[PDB]
Curated annotation (Swiss-Prot), chain A:
The keyword Nucleus applies. ATP-dependent DNA translocase. Component of the general transcription and DNA repair factor IIH (TFIIH) core complex. When complexed to CDK-activating kinase (CAK), involved in RNA transcription by RNA polymerase II. May have 3'-5' helicase activity alone, the TFIIH core however has no 3'-5' helicase activity. Also involved in transcription-coupled nucleotide excision repair (NER) of damaged DNA. In NER, TFIIH acts by opening DNA around the lesion to allow the excision of the damaged oligonucleotide and its replacement by a new DNA fragment. This is General transcription and DNA repair factor IIH helicase/translocase subunit XPB/SSL2. Coiled coil: none annotated. Component of the 7-subunit TFIIH core complex composed of XPB/SSL2, XPD/RAD3, SSL1, TFB1, TFB2, TFB4 and TFB5, which is active in NER. The core complex associates with the 3-subunit CTD-kinase module TFIIK composed of CCL1, KIN28 and TFB3 to form the 10-subunit holoenzyme (holo-TFIIH) active in transcription. An additionnal subunit, TFB6, plays a role in the dissociation of the SSL2 helicase from TFIIH after transcription initiation. Interacts directly with TFB6. Keywords: ATP-binding, DNA damage, DNA repair, DNA-binding, Helicase, Hydrolase, Isomerase, Nucleotide-binding, Nucleus, Phosphoprotein, Transcription, Transcription regulation. Optimum pH is 7.25 for helicase and ATPase activities. Disruption phenotype: Essential, it cannot be deleted; epistasis studies suggest it is involved in damaged DNA excision repair. It is found in: Nucleus. The chain holds residues 101 to 766 of 843 of the full protein. The keyword DNA-binding applies. Its cofactor is Mg(2+). Its main location: nucleus. The lineage of its organism: Eukaryota, Fungi, Dikarya, Ascomycota, Saccharomycotina. A motif (DEAH box) lies at residues 356-359.
Length: 634, 351, 754
């Protein structure tokens, strides 16, 4: 395989002892408590360099715990690659951390810290005459470059040449490290094996991307305008990928629907070569290009939206294109048009591929297409930390070292979705919910507790409260017929199942532009995928919504940027869940999920004057049972 | 290396009779984040602490507050000796967020008129909270500075972490040519000492001027409860004071009676001035080799004062900061308090 | 203050001293003991001319041989800076010693800057004012008023009285600066130009710019009595070679040939119409050609000369006959043939490179004028024009410039190159061709300066590196000593802003136009500093053409929108009076409460002589590193000669002058030791050019200030604004580098004499 597990070693290396665990020598004189056993850096308030330890630890590790006084750290195996790129010294990281953190630097923690600072994310790759050579930036890389089976064995004895480095660059190593060092030019066969030998020895390399030195690929028709929006999480993903001088390829997990592709297109502009965008599914290609990409300076007519059912121009574009994995290689090959793109992707030397939510598509096709396509570099703009695409070939080492992580706590607190007040509404029970819980336990009951009139009335508090507050109210309900029955009573336009698209955006038109209509009831038609709206109060009614990885994507998706800060809590979330019903387990999974995602959590069970709110239809227990039998039809 | 007062403040003359009007600034420059909450919220509180201490150390003075918003000079409290009204105005200032830029010349024009009703005996002073890097002068600001120096209106400005010549020229010009009031701030504690140094009088060189012999009164207490009344506020005052001359009731305060217009002070105004006029010499740390004192304190009982034959502990220092004339040792913590609130040296008094 | 250099009692004017001066003053005396040139990188933040003059002021009262001095600078602005500071020094000398100064020094600029007649002073251009005063009193025009009364010829009324009363002694006792000389001469009906032009032979110290010691048309009044045994100081001598390049350069245009043909035709009438007026006066000057080069009445005159000589001062010019062109009519013969030959040599296919000797040979076959006769045009034109008592000169201005080229072409060769581009590359493919001629070896004018001079001093605080100067100009130095600013406080932050808010490499090398990937970062830099920085911000763009697109496209977006409200912005403009009005309204704003920002050009006039004190500058921004490759291959042709005659390549020459230009602009922000301020520089290549920065600045640029973020640099200047603005005056750490009055210098420097 061309990927190594070292990009995803996270989730392990969190375990210590008491008699086995050694008491920290720095505990007597040290501000923080960085115990290598638990993988934590408990930075106390007395630290002389508490911010520095977080900066050094943040670059190299992941802080699992976020207490006000003392913090905690989580296992991050990929942090060696990111920690190496940041610049933390191999000895320097341990020496400062051991002295500052009270927990003494353990051999495994120090060796990994010593390895992470230098060996992790500090590989050596040479290049001569604007090409790839069998060498490295340092003396170790020069021995490493010649010691590679493809880097060294597949290398010509000539140190460097203008024609070979420009053309040939055991294939053209454009995923090499910093050039202008001792090396010797290489052959042009097997970058597949070249990235296979790197991962087996587990050597995370600080790769470069020298587009200007590649004569085989001409300069493509790219309309270089950065006029697209730039956002606090977007520039550093550019900056860290670009670094100094040449750019590189890697994994940058981003919020979907928050201009995730914006870094890639701007990164595509800088490299000036063949770039393609891969999306989750074909229907997303047109919907997402129509939802934000018009303001973007990318060219819709040149970026042929590959769908395999509607036909555009292919194998003929002089510039960039936008497609999906399903269009690339899946059972969703509607015709031979998709396979014709795949054949052209081999004859054309494609240097950059933008990925949008790879996790939905299994990675097995990712390796199949790469070998035939003969790609130079890639970019996987995923969203989820845990995924099914952790096969033998890790997409991190398949593409390159990670640069920036989807720090959702940064974007849900900086003004877009700041002050995330997650709630789970426990609507008061009654006889029929208890009658329905005992009689039947099948999943057909999934809508027989959703139909709670107090849930709708609990929503109606959020309807009246947030419209009075000038906020935005979003309701999530995978059902259709019962959801349609909901908002007719309150007599307002509302999103519903199989809504006409022009009407729903017209409902959205009164939603985020006008304040009188502010409640929108998104169905399962929302994902995947449609325009994820600006979120100020999100209501989720369906709580199973398999699987949990979809929930992380859906939680990040609908909860979107809100450019409004009047209230102290400018981003509400509510989980209207009937209690003493089946959704106890499903809701309690969400309750742990939101707090584990980092968002602030609360429980809203007592509305301000619950029984005095308007539209008291079906409030009495008798009327609620009648609707439950109507929902039996669904 | 020792950081204390150099030799001694020679007790001849200090300014107790004064009317210091601080000019705050609520400008979009103060919206820029330098302090912990922001520039605007933090400075107000340290001025709030400044006001009470200014009344604490200079109770025979009056206070005024000036704010600068949107390039306009705005007063929130007239020059007066009322601590609570000044804070109340600052709360509304605290409640609001800054906007615009400061207007130096308008404040200087405001300052000249504002201290015109200030009496001759009260030493004129205007405190400028100037933090931004620009002003708004609708005329010749060099003319008004020429007016304040000619009319004997000294100006001390409290600049933020920025240095401007016009403010430095303003400090130099008004203060009888002296350029020693241009200290700036860089920290939470750093800005407070500028206010705290403004709490104490500011002598550099007092010139020979026509001194005024002024008349002032001492009030008398009241005790009535059911007959609760006062002739100053005309409210239900269950306790107050009385001028010996006008027999017009006033609340329990140093408030000047509104009938015969003579200054009223109870005990603090004369006494708070007395400790300011004649400060004693600072209790410098007496040498450990030249201590010749017992292992304890004298003003209080601090037995800790000698490590004795303990390497880098012995030959260090000692809690033996002794007063000069009194020749009595005292701990550094104690001897600091000896010159912090009340001078009241034990060895000097115990004679 | 009165300290010694073991032989010189120095009457130092500042009560406090600066160790960099003492290091400068100690070694500069050794240069005076054993003659050299002694490039000394004296700090510019320190007062360089304060001890530069004061030591030399004490030089004359002790050393009795060097009765004359030369102070030469790039602009008259630094001449008067010397004048204003030195004027106090002479009065400071009288304050301590009594009456022992006996010093005379006046600035020499021109007729334009020192004219007092309201009729003459109206005009703006100096030459027109120079022409009006010269025609007001000319060796052939002013005689036509005294002998016969007329309204055609007026009188200066100030040269008239100078001709009567001023040239009998020296000015009474004042050491007049530009401001002081203007005031004195206004009330006493005198024009200050004719004083100092005559005062060359009487000034114990002579004050004039670099041109009047180097430029051949104006340096004909140089006196060996003030040149043989004198001491010469070159102030801001970093821009010395560039001036010499212009001295032997000249362009032409297709419009000018129409004027040149006008002058050729109009003078043809002029010389012929006066023939019937006085034909014997015409021929009388012909017998003046056979005898010699007209020496009796071409050089021994008070006012007569009209045509300037671009050749070296009369040494590189034979005195033989100028061919058979003696006749007035026959003068027309070769004039019209040569003007036609140059026109087809003005419409050349493209830039062609021929040795200027070969141009004479190609001329020789088309128009048979031998090289030796053609060298005599300059003294010919004055010999002929004087006879015609010409009254109209407008179309004749082309005659003096073309004939200036005629003297140059027949005399200079194998060091220069002739080029004729058919158009300007920025406005290519048009009938606007140039007779391009530019100087390739500046040392031809430099060497004769060192040929006669014995005491010479070269000093500049921006020269970096200091080693190519002796090899470029071919002069002998002995004391190459460098100075680093030793202070107890930083007071300056040279910055290497490679990465901006986008963290993208910023420069101006990529193009000479605007682009959203680049322009949004520079503007975001300007606004972010405008929020925080204190009053006084000066920037120096690489070129003025670059800035016009920069500001106009800045106006398109709302990036300046917040910059509008922060400070007061005044722009550098092609007209000098407006920019001086812009700059005079910049300094007042900076001193006043409101903040101000100035924008200028690295190659502009601002970087030449302008100073910026505390208020006038606190944070200076440098958009990129200025490369002067924008123009046509003229400089490429110029650069080739430097590559083979000297071992200085394009890469070494380009960056080292660019940083020299960069270091020239930066140091203006600091005035004294007390002065402080950040000097930010924004280009990626500034990482590599840390070597080209001056050692005093380069030392301040540690390896930790490379490729900073500008927002971090905002924090860096935020910390600078927090730290430096503090009135930190410990007064005990001063004495290490402040050397309080007459105490620590005598105490400590005796330990330094080892
Ligand atoms: S006489 Fe003197 S002042 Fe008058 S125009 Fe001539 S040079 Fe100028
Ligand atoms: Zn009352
Ligand atoms: Zn009274
Ligand atoms: Zn005492
Ligand atoms: Zn004590």
């Amino acid at each position: 395989p061309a990927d190594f597990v070292p990009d995803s070693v996270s989730g392990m290396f969190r375990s210590h002892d008491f008699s086995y665990l050694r008491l920290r020598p720095d505990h007597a004189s040290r501000p923080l408590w960085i115990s290598p056993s638990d993988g934590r850096i408990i930075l106390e308030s007395f630290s002389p360099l508490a911010e520095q330890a977080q900066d050094f630890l943040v670059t190299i590790a992941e802080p699992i715990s976020r207490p006000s006084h003392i913090h905690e750290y989580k296992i991050t195996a990929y942090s060696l690659y990111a920690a190496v790129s940041v610049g933390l010294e191999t000895d320097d990281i341990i020496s400062v951390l051991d002295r500052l953190s009270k927990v003494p630097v353990a051999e495994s923690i120090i060796n990994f810290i010593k390895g992470a600072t230098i060996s992790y994310g500090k590989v050596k790759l040479v290049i001569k005459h604007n090409r790839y050579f069998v060498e490295t930036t340092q003396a170790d890389i020069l021995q490493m470059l010649l010691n590679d089976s493809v880097i060294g064995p597949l290398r010509i004895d000539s140190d460097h040449q203008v024609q070979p480095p420009e053309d040939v660059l055991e294939r053209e190593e454009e995923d090499d490290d910093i050039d202008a060092v001792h090396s010797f030019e290489i052959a042009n066969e097997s970058v597949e094996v070249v990235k296979k030998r790197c991962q087996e020895i587990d050597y995370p390399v600080l790769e470069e991307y020298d587009f200007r030195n590649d004569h085989r690929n001409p300069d493509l028709d790219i309309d270089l305008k950065p006029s697209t929006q730039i956002r606090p999480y977007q520039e550093k993903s550019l900056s860290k990928m670009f670094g100094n001088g040449r750019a590189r390829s890697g994994i940058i997990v981003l919020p979907c629907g928050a201009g995730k592709t914006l870094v890639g297109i701007t990164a595509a502009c800088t490299i000036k070569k063949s770039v393609i965008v891969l999306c989750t599914s074909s229907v997303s290609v047109m919907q997402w290009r129509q939802q934000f990409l018009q303001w973007c300076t990318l060219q819709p007519e040149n970026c042929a939206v590959f769908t395999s059912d509607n036909k555009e121009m292919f194998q003929t574009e002089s510039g960039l294109v936008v497609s999906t994995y399903s269009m690339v290689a899946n059972t969703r090959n509607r015709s031979h048009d998709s396979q014709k793109v795949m054949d052209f992707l081999t004859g054309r030397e494609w240097g950059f591929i933008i990925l949008d939510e790879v996790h939905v598509v299994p990675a097995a096709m990712f390796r199949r297409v790469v070998s035939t396509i003969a790609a130079h570099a890639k970019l996987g703009l995923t969203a989820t930390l845990v995924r099914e695409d952790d096969k033998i070939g890790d997409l991190n080492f398949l593409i390159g070292p990670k640069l920036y992580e989807a720090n959702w706590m940064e974007l849900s607190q900086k003004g877009h979705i700041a002050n995330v007040q997650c709630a789970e509404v426990w609507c008061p029970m009654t006889a029929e919910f208890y009658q329905e819980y005992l009689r039947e336990t099948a999943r057909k009951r999934m809508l027989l507790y959703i139909m709670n009139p107090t849930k709708f009335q609990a929503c109606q508090f959020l309807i009246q409260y947030h419209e009075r507050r000038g906020d935005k109210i979003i309701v999530f309900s995978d059902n259709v017929y019962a959801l349609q029955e909901y908002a007719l009573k309150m007599g307002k336009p509302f999103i519903y199942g199989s809504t006409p698209q022009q009407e729903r955006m017209n409902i959205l038109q009164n939603f985020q532009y006008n304040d009188q209509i502010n409640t929108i009831f998104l169905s399962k038609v929302g994902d995947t995928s449609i325009d994820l709206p600006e979120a100020t109060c999100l209501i989720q009614i369906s709580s199973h919504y398999g699987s949990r990885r979809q929930e992380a994507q859906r939680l990040g998706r609908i909860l979107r940027a809100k450019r409004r800060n009047d209230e102290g809590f400018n981003a509400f979330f509510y989980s209207l869940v009937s209690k003493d019903t089946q959704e106890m387990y499903y809701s309690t999974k969400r309750q742990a999920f939101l707090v584990d995602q980092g968002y602030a959590f609360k429980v809203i069970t007592h509305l301000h004057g619950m029984e005095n709110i308007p539209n008291l239809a079906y409030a009495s227990p008798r009327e609620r049972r009648e609707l439950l039998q109507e929902v039996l039809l669904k | 290396k020792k950081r204390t007062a150099k030799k001694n403040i020679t007790p001849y003359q200090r300014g107790i009779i004064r009317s210091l009007i601080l000019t705050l600034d609520c400008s979009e420059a103060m919206l820029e984040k330098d302090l912990r909450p922001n520039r605007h919220a933090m400075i107000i509180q340290y001025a709030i602490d400044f006001v009470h201490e200014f009344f604490d150390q200079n109770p025979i003075s009056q206070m005024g507050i000036i704010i600068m918003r949107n390039g306009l000079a705005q007063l929130v409290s007239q020059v007066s000796g009322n601590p609570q009204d000044h804070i109340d105005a600052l709360k509304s200032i605290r409640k609001q967020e800054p906007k615009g830029n400061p207007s130096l010349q308008n404040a200087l024009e405001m300052a000249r008129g504002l201290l015109l009703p200030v009496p001759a005996h009260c030493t004129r002073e205007v405190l400028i909270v100037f933090g931004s890097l620009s002003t708004t002068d609708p005329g010749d600001i060099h003319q008004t500075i020429d007016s304040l120096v000619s009319e004997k209106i000294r100006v001390k400005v409290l600049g933020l972490s920025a240095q401007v010549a016009i403010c430095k020229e303003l400090c130099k010009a008004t203060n009888y040519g002296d350029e020693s009031f241009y200290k700036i701030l860089l920290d939470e504690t750093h800005l407070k000492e500028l206010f705290n140094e403004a709490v104490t009088p500011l002598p550099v060189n007092k010139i020979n001027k026509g001194f005024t012999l002024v008349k002032m009164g001492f009030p008398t207490r009241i005790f009535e409860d059911t007959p609760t009344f006062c002739s100053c506020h005309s409210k239900l005052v269950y306790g107050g004071y009385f001028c010996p001359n006008c027999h017009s009731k006033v609340c329990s305060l140093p408030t000047v009676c509104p009938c015969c217009d003579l200054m009223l002070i109870l005990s603090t105004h004369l006494a708070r001035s007395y400790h300011h006029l004649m400060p004693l010499k600072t209790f410098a740390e007496v040498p450990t080799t030249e201590k010749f004192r017992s292992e304890d304190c004298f003003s209080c009982q601090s037995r800790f004062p000698x490590x004795x034959x303990x390497x880098x502990x012995x030959x260090x220092x000692x809690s033996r900061y002794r007063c000069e004339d009194c020749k009595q040792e005292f701990c550094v913590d104690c001897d600091v308090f000896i010159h912090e609130i009340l001078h009241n040296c034990p060895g000097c008094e115990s004679k | 203050m009165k300290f010694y250099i073991d032989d010189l009692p120095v009457l130092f004017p500042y009560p406090k001293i600066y160790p960099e001066q003492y290091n400068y003053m100690c070694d500069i005396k050794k240069t005076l003991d054993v003659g050299g040139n002694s490039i000394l990188e004296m700090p510019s933040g320190t007062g360089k001319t304060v001890s530069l003059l004061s030591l030399t002021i004490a030089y004359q009262m002790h050393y009795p041989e060097h009765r004359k001095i030369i102070y030469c600078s790039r602009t008259m602005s630094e001449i008067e800076k010397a004048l204003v500071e030195l004027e106090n020094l002479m009065d400071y000398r009288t304050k301590e010693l009594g009456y022992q100064e006996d010093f005379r020094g006046l600035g020499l600029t021109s007729r334009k800057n020192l004219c007092l007649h309201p009729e003459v002073s109206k005009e703006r251009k100096g030459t027109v004012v120079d022409e009006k005063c010269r025609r007001m009193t000319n060796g052939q025009a002013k005689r036509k008023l005294e002998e016969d009364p007329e309204a055609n010829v007026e009188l200066c009324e100030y040269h008239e009285n100078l001709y009567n009363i001023e040239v009998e002694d020296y000015l009474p006792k004042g050491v007049f600066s530009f401001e002081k000389l203007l005031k004195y001469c206004e009330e006493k009906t005198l024009c200050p130009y004719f004083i100092v032009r005559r005062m060359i032979s009487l000034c114990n110290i002579i004050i004039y710019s670099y041109h009047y010691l180097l430029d051949p048309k104006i340096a004909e009044r140089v006196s060996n009595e003030v040149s043989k045994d004198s001491i010469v100081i070159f102030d801001e001598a970093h821009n010395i070679d560039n001036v010499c390049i212009e001295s032997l350069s000249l362009d032409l245009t297709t419009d000018a040939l129409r004027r040149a043909t006008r002058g050729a035709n109009a003078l043809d009438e002029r010389i012929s119409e006066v023939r019937k007026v006085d034909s014997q006066k015409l021929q009388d000057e012909y017998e003046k050609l056979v005898q010699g080069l007209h020496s009796a009445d071409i050089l021994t005159d008070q006012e007569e000369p009209f045509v300037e000589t671009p050749v070296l001062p009369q040494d590189l010019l034979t005195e033989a006959i100028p061919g058979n062109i003696r006749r007035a009519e026959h003068f027309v013969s070769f004039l019209k043939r040569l003007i036609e030959y140059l026109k087809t040599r003005m419409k050349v296919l493209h830039v062609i490179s021929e040795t200027p000797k070969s141009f004479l040979q190609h001329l020789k076959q088309l128009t048979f004028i031998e090289r030796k006769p053609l060298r005599f045009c300059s003294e010919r034109l004055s010999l002929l024009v004087r006879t015609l008592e010409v009254t109209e000169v407008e179309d004749f201005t082309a005659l003096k410039d073309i004939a200036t080229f005629a003297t140059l072409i027949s005399t200079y060769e194998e060091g220069f190159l002739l080029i004729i581009e058919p158009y300007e590359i920025e406005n290519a493919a048009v009938p606007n061709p140039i007779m391009r001629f530019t100087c390739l070896d500046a040392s031809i004018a430099i060497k004769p300066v060192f040929e006669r001079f014995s005491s010479v001093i070269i000093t500049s605080g921006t020269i970096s590196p200091l080693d190519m100067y002796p090899r470029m100009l071919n002069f002998k130095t002995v004391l190459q000593k460098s100075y680093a600013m030793t202070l107890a406080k930083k007071s300056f932050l040279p910055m290497i802003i490679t990465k901006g808010s986008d963290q993208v490499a910023i420069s101006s090398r990529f193009e000479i136009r605007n682009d959203p990937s680049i322009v949004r970062n520079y503007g975001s830099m300007l606004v972010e500093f405008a929020k925080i920085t204190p009053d006084g911000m000066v920037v120096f763009f690489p070129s003025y053409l670059y800035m016009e697109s920069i500001v106009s496209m800045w106006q398109t977006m709302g990036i300046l929108d917040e910059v509008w409200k922060h400070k007061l912005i005044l722009v550098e403009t092609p007209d000098a009076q407006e920019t001086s009005l812009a700059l005079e309204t910049y300094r007042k704003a900076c001193s006043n409460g409101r903040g101000a920002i100035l924008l200028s050009v690295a190659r502009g006039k601002v970087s030449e002589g302008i100073d910026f004190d505390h208020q006038y500058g606190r944070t200076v921004l440098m958009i990129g590193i200025p490369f002067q490759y924008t123009e046509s291959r003229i400089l490429k042709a110029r650069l080739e000669f430097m590559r083979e005659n000297y071992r200085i390549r394009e890469n070494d020459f380009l960056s080292f002058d660019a940083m020299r230009h960069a270091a020239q602009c930066l140091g203006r922000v600091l005035r004294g030791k007390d002065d402080y301020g950040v000097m930010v520089l924004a280009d990626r290549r500034f990482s590599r050019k840390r070597s080209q920065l001056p050692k005093w600045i380069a030392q301040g640029l540690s390896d930790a200030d490379l490729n900073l973020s500008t927002d971090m640099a905002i924090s860096n200047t935020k910390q600078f604004l927090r730290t430096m603005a503090q009135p930190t005056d410990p007064k005990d750490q001063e004495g290490v580098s402040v050397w309080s009055y007459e105490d620590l210098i005598k105490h400590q420097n005796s330990r330094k004499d080892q």
